[PDB]
Write a protein that binds this DNA or RNA. Structure first.
Lengths: 122, 157, 544, 325, 85
DNA sequence: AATAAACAATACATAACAAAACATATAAAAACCA
DNA sequence: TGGTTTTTATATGTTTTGTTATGTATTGTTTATT
């Protein structure tokens, strides 16, 4: 059962969503208006906070501690850069990706009482 | 529940009826017609937008009384909750929070704040600045306390 | 003038002293607690590094320090007739199998000559260390940040150390400073080497937050440093509950930061801070007497006074009609000790050893005390059920405490410590009126340069065309003001030839547009996708 | 896909741009700008008091802060602290982060010389940078608490300072009590740079400063297509007089028909056309002074044997009436 | 169709380790041996991405194809029905 | 249930391209012996 | 300090792979008749 905090826990649970998901489908199915086996896809920045703001219990707006736990998660090597480990800060072309298998995601979903198996649909 | 009975036009005679009771001056009373005419084209529901704009300007044109009397803030919304025959005060505040960001990218409100000189200004330039000398509202302020004082001690003697 | 050259150096209170006697005195309690865990971490490694005599004696001893912050320093015993050296290998110094060997042999070798009073930097020195330096060798490996290294390099590294096990005058010891996730580590390595690792492993936990043995301790030593001279309000402490829960690794350095900054706020604005010692009663003034009046518990008790005593001639006299009795009405309630501090210290040591309970947070224990939820606090062990009546305290509604208190009733240290970063930027660019108050008449009829496109920048698509955005940008600029602006100056000549040109307005727009979108790249708001084409860009910044 | 493009824009030369840009940035919103500058001036005693606590002060906000930091660090703070400790005042070491040529070795070589060389620290110089600063830290834990240095780091998200081996270097500097760290960033993703490890070493606090400055110095290193159609605009101004004529005959029939491939001309007839006006002797004498148009990438060729100019339809008639005529 | 110990997840890795160093599998894009020294030295400094994805997702490919297994595995073994599809 | 015929709606093969993996090169930084 | 080697940043090239648009071919849908 992983050490990380609650907002960082939901930070992990949004990062696993773009495993088998692509930008062609996500904005339709997560509107405000199976690759469980396969290798994970590539992120960009702010697609996290696109999904993070949606799935959090207007109740949150300050994102200073949310930006804190990203590079906390970068030191844990649970989400790593596609390129070399140097310039990833300033938004040049940098793609991100998870490195955690499905089971540790599945326990950490129920550890914060959040349901994830609904949104994975072959 | 007149606010949820949507898709009705508030004509030029109809909208000036909706603002002469809330005591709007001629500067904004034409502007409400001006920006409804902006938003008569791209609307979704005409009842929600027409009331959301009239509250925040009365929040900013009557703030020389609103910051000096907290009781009239319920008075202005409940007299519209009786006028629009709303359900409760839950849905009406949901409107005024909504359209406020929807009018924050326009021109005239950035004028209407700085034309009316209304706001208070030196608080916000010290709140957003992160001043250690900003007002902490664990207190009641000296004016409102003196408003409390002169009301009570003359009620006393 | 010189700003394009990088890093050029150049060589160009009655209230605050009462802070100074309080601040450092608190900080003597801080750092003395800091060396306690510093002596704790240095102790528990040291005994466990020794006295472990295994029977096979052909295996290194490994130590996994779970939960450790990758900065844990270690001291070693002297242990004469044998040198004991420390090598540290940072993932920055882990490029390959090769230089991980070569720098590490270099790092001990200079450490070997300095104690000794040409050679080759590989394992050749390791066997001849008996002859090269006399006494034997016991090296230790402070792997600082172990999960960032490519583990096959680490797995190939430890097989290289396995070959050194046949010389019998050298002893190896490995220190694995993981950040977390021991189960992750047994996944990454080769399984043939885990069986090499599993001879004598020790899973010692080192965490700053371990059952709150120091978290509840440092808040406790905070309370006695401010004992009786202040209070801690309910909305303040829940901020300390919520925000400190968002940082798992180092609460203890954070609780020093947000508390001491909170104390810095009190001394900098509150005038009654001088009166926390009763010797300062001679500094009393009518200006101090005027500002005491607007306290909420002051005026509420007067409302309590009139309804209790419907005769108000006494109450009117003790108002500003008198001033000597008026301050005497204040200093009646001046010395209020507020035993919620002492009642906390009463119950803190109790359940620590009477019921002997350790999984508890003293701050919410102080917070549940502030509402009266201490009964619904002890329930989570059902062990104070024989003691809920003797550890009972109803929090009394104390009087005049709003002058000696700390609370984020203004949202100050919410803002200045945890700032809503991209919220405050985006609020600065849509509104701009509450930040900024001949040519200023143009400013009252024209927005500033950065913000005027921002309203259309919201109203633009995901990927946008450059020129049509400028075409929309030219709509927001009215024509008569610019020619009034470009012809404002008769003194300059070089501008004035541009001022009389009939296409000056459409030229000065693209100049001004290429100073603003030029300035939206260092902020990272807009990214130039597919360079040397730059016909379309991408906007990442959304409102939320 | 009929898209309006930056090529289809009324362009502006070098001296025309920068002068009228200098007019706006010194006369647009001048009165409210110093009106802001007087408002924030009262915060200056508050910064002095907190900075005694060794707090790494960080300034965010829209607009450039470069002028504001240099007023606040140099003129206000650095003699005020020297007077309040009791002689030259406190040394200011700025770091221009917008200058990409900042390294970790050179600035730290300044630092240990800016700081005290009380011991032979060149003996520990052997990557020993983290090693040499660690021996600096533990000695500084047992010294009398007084600031001897204030450093400024402008544009902390800059192109070299945001590199990760440099960032951790500054992290160990900030835990020392003797030095005050007053820096500013401008990025919207600046708090992606720090975890709870570094901010533990940093203990950052934040303040907003938004004066909507134009960033004069910070615009210089940056470039867009203002800074080729404009490139070969200057080479033709210094060549032989015949190259002007053979480009004029080139530009006519290449604009007889955007300027794309299809409007171009075959090599044989163009040799005959430039033989018609007694200009091209043969293919070699044509091609050799056509390689000079090739070497400065002033014309293209694709396949008829089509040579075509890569500039737009609007650009070539601008090249017609101005420089060729 | 019939008593055979189905193994776990945490143990097949120990068998999976020998199978890749028995060269029955290969990594997907892995140039094995460089020709000379300075081409190999240029591959040593290069930090890799396949280690940065975990052990159970390194896309391993095949050295010995399925159809050839039927010719070598005798029919007496029970898995002979699985050589052919 | 089958056949036929007119018409509409969908799928398919490939063209054109984008982007990521895979690969090399060299000047500037940065260690690093010495 | 000082030369020398090693790594990194910047820059471009190569091959595989996956997405999308579109004109043409296929397939479904309805109605009359056997």
């Amino acid at each position: 059962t992983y050490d990380l905090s609650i907002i960082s826990k939901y930070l992990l649970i949004a990062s696993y969503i773009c495993s088998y998901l692509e930008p062609r489908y996500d904005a339709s199915i997560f509107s405000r208006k199976n690759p469980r086996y396969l290798q994970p896809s590539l992120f960009a920045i702010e697609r996290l906070l696109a999904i993070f703001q949606a799935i959090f219990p207007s109740l949150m707006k300050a994102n200073i501690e949310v930006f804190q736990n990203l590079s906390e998660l970068h030191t844990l090597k649970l989400i790593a850069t596609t390129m070399n480990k140097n310039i990833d800060y300033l938004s040049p072309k940098v793609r991100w990706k998870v490195n955690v298998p499905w089971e540790i995601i599945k326990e950490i979903s129920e550890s914060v009482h959040f349901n994830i198996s609904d949104y994975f649909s072959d | 529940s007149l606010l949820v009975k949507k898709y009705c036009k508030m004509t030029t005679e109809e909208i000036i009826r909706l603002c002469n009771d809330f005591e709007l001056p001629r500067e904004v009373a034409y502007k409400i017609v001006d920006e409804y005419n902006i938003n008569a084209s791209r609307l979704v529901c005409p009842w929600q937008l027409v009331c959301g704009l009239v509250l925040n300007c009365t929040f900013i044109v009557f703030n020389e009384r609103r910051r000096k009397d907290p009781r009239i803030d319920h008075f202005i919304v409940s007299k519209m909750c009786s006028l629009m025959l709303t359900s409760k005060v839950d849905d009406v505040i949901e409107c005024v929070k909504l359209v406020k960001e929807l009018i924050i990218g326009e021109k005239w409100f950035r004028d209407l704040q700085i034309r009316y000189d209304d706001f208070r200004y030196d608080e916000i330039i010290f709140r957003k600045l992160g001043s250690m000398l900003q007002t902490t509202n664990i207190l009641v302020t000296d004016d409102q306390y003196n408003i409390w004082k002169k009301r009570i001690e003359m009620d006393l003697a | 003038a010189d700003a394009q050259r990088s890093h050029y150096t150049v060589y160009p209170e009655k209230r605050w002293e009462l802070y100074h006697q309080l601040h450092s005195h608190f900080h003597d309690q801080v750092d003395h607690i800091i060396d306690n865990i510093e002596a704790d971490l240095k102790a528990e490694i040291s005994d466990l590094l020794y006295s472990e005599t295994t029977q096979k004696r052909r295996c290194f001893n490994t130590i996994f320090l779970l939960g450790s912050d990758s900065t844990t320093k270690i001291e070693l015993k002297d242990e004469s007739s044998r040198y004991n050296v420390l090598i540290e290998l940072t993932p920055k110094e882990s490029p390959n199998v090769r230089m991980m060997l070569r720098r590490s042999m270099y790092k001990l070798y200079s450490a070997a000559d300095a104690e000794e009073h040409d050679v080759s930097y590989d394992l050749s020195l390791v066997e001849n260390f008996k002859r090269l330096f006399g006494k034997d060798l016991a090296m230790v490996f402070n792997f600082k940040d172990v999960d960032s290294i490519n583990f096959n390099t680490l797995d190939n590294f430890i097989i290289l150390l396995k070959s050194a096990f046949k010389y019998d005058h050298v002893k190896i010891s490995l220190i694995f400073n993981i950040n977390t996730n021991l189960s992750n580590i047994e996944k990454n390595l080769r399984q043939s080497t885990i069986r090499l690792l599993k001879r004598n492993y020790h899973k010692l936990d080192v965490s700053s937050n371990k059952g709150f043995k120091y978290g509840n301790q440092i808040f406790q030593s905070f309370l006695d440093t401010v004992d009786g001279k202040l209070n801690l309000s309910d909305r303040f402490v829940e901020f300390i509950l919520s925000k400190m829960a968002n940082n798992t690794n180092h609460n203890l350095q954070l609780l020093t930061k947000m508390l001491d900054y909170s104390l810095m706020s009190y001394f900098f604005q509150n005038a009654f801070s001088v009166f926390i010692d009763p010797v300062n009663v001679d500094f009393l003034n009518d200006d101090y007497l005027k500002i005491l009046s607007r306290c909420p518990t002051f005026m509420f008790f007067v409302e309590g006074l009139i309804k209790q005593h419907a005769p108000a001639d006494e109450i009117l006299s003790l108002l500003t009609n008198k001033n000597r009795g008026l301050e005497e009405f204040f200093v009646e309630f001046l010395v209020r000790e507020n035993p919620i501090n002492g009642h906390a210290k009463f119950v803190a040591r109790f359940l620590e050893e009477e019921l002997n309970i350790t999984n508890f947070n003293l701050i919410e224990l102080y917070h549940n005390l502030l509402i009266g939820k201490l009964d619904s606090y002890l329930d989570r062990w059902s062990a104070c059920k024989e003691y809920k009546d003797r550890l009972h305290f109803e929090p009394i509604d104390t009087i005049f405490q709003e002058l000696f208190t700390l609370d984020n009733r203004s949202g100050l240290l919410t803002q200045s410590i945890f700032p809503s970063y991209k919220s405050n930027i985006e609020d600065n660019l849509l509104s701009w009126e509450q930040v900024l108050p001949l040519s200023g008449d143009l400013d009252k009829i024209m927005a500033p340069v950065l913000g005027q496109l921002f309203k259309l920048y919201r109203e633009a698509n995901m990927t946008i065309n450059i020129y049509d955005f400028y075409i929309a940008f030219r709509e927001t600029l009215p024509k008569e003001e610019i020619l009034n602006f470009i012809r404002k100056d008769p003194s300059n000549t070089k501008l004035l030839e541009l001022a009389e040109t009939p296409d000056a307005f459409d030229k000065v727009a693209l100049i001004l547009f290429m100073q603003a979108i030029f300035a939206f790249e260092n902020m990272g708001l807009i990214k130039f996708q597919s360079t040397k084409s730059y016909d379309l860009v991408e906007k990442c910044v959304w409102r939320g | 896909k009929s898209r309006h493009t930056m090529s289809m824009a009324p362009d502006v030369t070098r001296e025309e741009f920068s002068l009228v840009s200098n007019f706006f940035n010194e006369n647009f919103q001048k009165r409210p700008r110093q009106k802001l500058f007087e408002i924030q001036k009262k915060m200056f005693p508050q910064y002095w008091f907190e900075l005694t606590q060794g707090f790494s002060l960080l300034f965010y906000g829209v607009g450039s802060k470069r002028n504001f930091l240099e007023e606040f660090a140099i003129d206000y703070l650095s003699p005020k602290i020297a007077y309040s400790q009791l002689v030259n005042s406190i040394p200011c070491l700025i770091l221009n982060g917008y200058n990409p040529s900042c390294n970790y070795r050179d600035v730290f070589k300044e630092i240990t010389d800016l700081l005290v060389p009380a011991e032979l620290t060149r003996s520990e110089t052997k990557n020993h940078v983290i090693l040499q600063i660690q021996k600096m830290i533990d000695f500084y834990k047992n010294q009398p608490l007084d600031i001897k240095l204030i450093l400024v780091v402008h544009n902390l998200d800059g192109p070299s300072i945001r590199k990760n081996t440099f960032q951790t270097m500054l992290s160990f500097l900030s835990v020392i009590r003797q030095i005050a760290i007053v820096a500013s960033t401008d990025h919207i993703y600046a708090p992606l740079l720090w975890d709870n490890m570094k901010a533990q070493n940093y203990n950052f606090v934040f303040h907003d400063i938004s004066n909507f400055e134009p960033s004069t110095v910070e615009s210089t290193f940056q470039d867009v297509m203002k800074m080729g159609a404009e490139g070969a605009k200057y080479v033709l101004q210094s060549l032989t007089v015949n190259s002007k004529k053979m480009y004029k005959l080139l530009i006519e029939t290449q604009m007889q028909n955007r300027g794309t491939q299809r409007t171009g001309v075959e090599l044989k007839l163009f040799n005959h056309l430039c033989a018609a006006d007694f200009i091209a002797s043969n293919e070699i004498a044509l091609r050799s002074m056509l390689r000079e148009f090739i070497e400065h990438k002033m014309a293209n060729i694709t396949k008829m044997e089509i040579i075509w100019v890569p500039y737009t339809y609007a650009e070539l008639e601008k090249l017609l009436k101005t420089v060729l005529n | 169709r019939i008593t055979i110990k189905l193994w776990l997840k945490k143990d097949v890795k120990n068998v999976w380790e020998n199978l890749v160093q028995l060269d029955f599998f290969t990594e997907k894009s892995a140039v094995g041996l460089r020709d000379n020294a300075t081409a190999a030295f240029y591959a040593s400094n290069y930090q890799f991405q396949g280690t940065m994805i975990p052990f159970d997702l390194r896309s391993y490919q095949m050295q010995i194809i399925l159809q050839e297994l039927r010719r070598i595995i005798p029919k007496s073994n029970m898995y002979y029905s699985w050589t052919q599809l």
